[PDB]
Amino acid sequence: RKQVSDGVAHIHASFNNTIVTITDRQGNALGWATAGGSGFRGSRKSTPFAAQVAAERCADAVKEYGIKNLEVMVKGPGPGRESTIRALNAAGFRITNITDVTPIPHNGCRPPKKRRV
RNA sequence: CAAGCUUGAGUCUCGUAGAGGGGGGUAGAAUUCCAGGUGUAGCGGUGAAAUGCGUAGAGAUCUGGAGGAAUACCGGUGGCG
């Protein structure tokens, strides 16, 4: 548990959940928190409020590392794309960059079939 | 039947556009898998769940590798056959 002061907030904003992982510049994870692990199951898990409290709890899992400036890498179409960024900025964090890294295949693999719901 | 004619039908000259066809090569993004680092209790999924994966360390993230398939943007009641 040494001091970093330079982190990256990897937000995995899926349709069903939101996973926030704070790593250093190299990519080694220091702490993480999810919407499902913050007391939300089912319908409450895929909400911007659950993502916000997950970003709040993940920012507390790295208080021993003393991060002052951290990057934001958003990935996924689900809710909590901007809610986690707001919850990270409100937690006393200097957001230096925000980046969308959602994977886009250049017409690669075949996706599953449509749901006849 | 015989001889014609050039307007139908073709040949030649010079260019133009095109996912037209057959063969070979190669590029990047992504999925999956394998090995390793960080890291910890969830992940995944749904109307809600459960089956399923996960403390034998999953999911997340980072690095390297393997393999196959299809070619985002261009891209368009656009083009060729």
Which technique was the structure solved with, according to the deposited record? cryo-EM
Task: Give the resolution in Å.
Answer: 2.5
From the CA of A105 to the C1' of B20: give the distance in Å.
Answer: 29
Q: Are A99 and A72 in contact (CB under 8 A)?
A: yes
d(CA A8, CA A46): 23
Q: Strand B: which bases are under 7 Å from protein Cβ?
A: 28-31, 37-49, 59-63, 68-72
Q: Which residue places its CA closest to the C1' of nucleotide B31?
A: A109
Phi-psi region of A65 (alpha: psi -120 to 50; beta: other; left: phi over 0): alpha
Q: Are A37 and A92 in contact (CB under 8 A)?
A: no
Structural domains of chain A, count:
1
Q: Which residues touch strand B (CB under 7 A)?
A: A 10, 12, 14-17, 19, 21, 23, 26-32, 34-37, 41-43, 45-46, 73, 75, 103-110, 115, 117
Q: What beta strand segments (E) does A42-114 contain? A: 69-75, 94-100
Token duo for residue A1: 């548990």
β-pair partners for A95: A70
From the CA of A4 to the C1' of B58: give the distance in Å.
Answer: 27
Nucleotide nearest to A102 (CA to C1'): B30
Token duo for residue A20: 């926030």
- Which residue range is the domain that position A67 belongs to? 1-117
